[PDB]
């Protein structure tokens, strides 16, 4: 599935950042027995990569009703929301620190029991720069 | 002499009309998903 992300953003310390991740025509599934387009139970994962560092997991949102799980390293200053109408996901990070400069990726998770935590498709990545 | 003997399963067929169900190997107009999954190896017998 194709993922589209918002452009580069530059912020000052203590500000707030919002990065958009759109997954067109992928929020809905067709349960044939029920004969309708229902919203599937997909998970959109949010990850960041510091310059030259490894990957780090931020949190993921369940498309069905917006269930969220947040990494304890970011609890209290991160909010991941999705809009089923626009098929977009929003990462709202607050109290940005100078070490948050990273490329933030949104990933698509089919949420299949047989294969857990499968981040099948990835966005192009968004550069977020924080400095004074 | 002779006597009547009944046989089961003889290869005898008559022309007839009957309902035929679908089988096939995104959602489509023909509802091919509703068709039963066909056998991967069809059986064909030469008469």
Q: Quick one: which of A109, A111, A28 has its CA closest to A123? A: A109
Name the CA radius of gyration of chain B, rounded: 19
User: Backbone breaks in chain B (C–N > 2.5 Å) follow which residues?
Assistant: 25
Q: Quick one: which of A10, A16, A67 has its CA closest to A42? A: A67
Query: What residues in A contact B34, CB-CB < 8 Å?
Result: 32
Contact A38/B at CB under 8 A: no
Quote the tokens at residue A8: 């580069």
Q: How far apart are CA A123 and CA A22, in angstroms?
A: 9
Quote the tokens at residue B16: 């007839």
Element (H, E) at A28: strand A28-31
Measured in angstroms, the resolution is 3.8
Task: Give the phi and the psi of residue A55 in degrees, each rounded to 5.
Answer: -90, 150
Q: Contact A37/A94 with Cβ under 8 angstroms?
A: no
Query: What residues in B contact A32, CB-CB < 8 Å?
Result: 27, 33-34
Q: Tell me the shortest Cα–Cα distance from A63 to chain B, in angstroms.
A: 20
For chains A and B, CB pairs below 8 A equal 4
Q: How far apart are CA A91 and CA A58, in angstroms?
A: 10
Residue burial A102-112, b: 16+ Cβ < 10 Å; e: rest:
bbbbbbbbebe
**3-state secondary structure (DSSP) of residue B34:** helix
Contact A33/B at CB under 8 A: no
Q: Strand B23-24 to strand B36-37: parallel, antiparallel, or no bridges (unpaired)?
A: parallel
What number of helices (H) and strands (E) belong to chain A?
0, 13
Q: Tell me the shortest Cα–Cα distance from B5 to chain A, in angstroms.
A: 51
Furthest CA-CA distance within chain A: 57
Quote the tokens at residue A100: 């948050």
Q: Contact A105/A6 with Cβ under 8 angstroms?
A: no
A13-32 residues touching B, CB cutoff 8 A: 30, 32
Q: How far is CA A45 from CA A58, B3, B46, in A?
A: 8, 81, 57
Q: Contact A82/A19 with Cβ under 8 angstroms?
A: no
Task: Give the phi and the psi of residue B11 in degrees, each rounded to 5.
Answer: -80, 80
Q: Contact A8/A129 with Cβ under 8 angstroms?
A: yes
Q: How far apart are CA A78 and CA A74, in angstroms?
A: 6
């Amino acid at each position: 599935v194709r993922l589209d992300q918002s452009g580069t953003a530059v912020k000052k310390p203590g500000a707030s950042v919002r990065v958009s991740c759109r997954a067109p025509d992928s929020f809905t599934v067709y349960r044939p027995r029920l004969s309708a387009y229902f919203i599937g139970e997909f998970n959109i994962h949010w990850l960041r990569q510091a310059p030259g560092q490894g990957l780090e997991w931020l949190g993921f949102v369940n498309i069905f009703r917006g269930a969220v799980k947040y990494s304890s390293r970011f609890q209290g200053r991160i909010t991941i929301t999705r809009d089923t109408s626009s098929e977009t996901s929003y990462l709202d990070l607050g109290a940005l620190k100078a070490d948050d400069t990273a490329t933030y990726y949104c990933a698509w998770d089919k949420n299949v029991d047989d294969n857990p935590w499968r981040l099948d498709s990835w966005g192009q990545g968004t550069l977020v720069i924080v400095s004074s | 002499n002779l006597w009547v003997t009944v046989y089961y399963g003889v290869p005898v067929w008559k022309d007839a009309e009957t309902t035929l169900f679908c089988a096939s190997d995104k959602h489509n107009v023909w509802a091919t998903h509703a068709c039963v999954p066909t056998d991967p190896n069809p059986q064909e017998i030469h008469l």
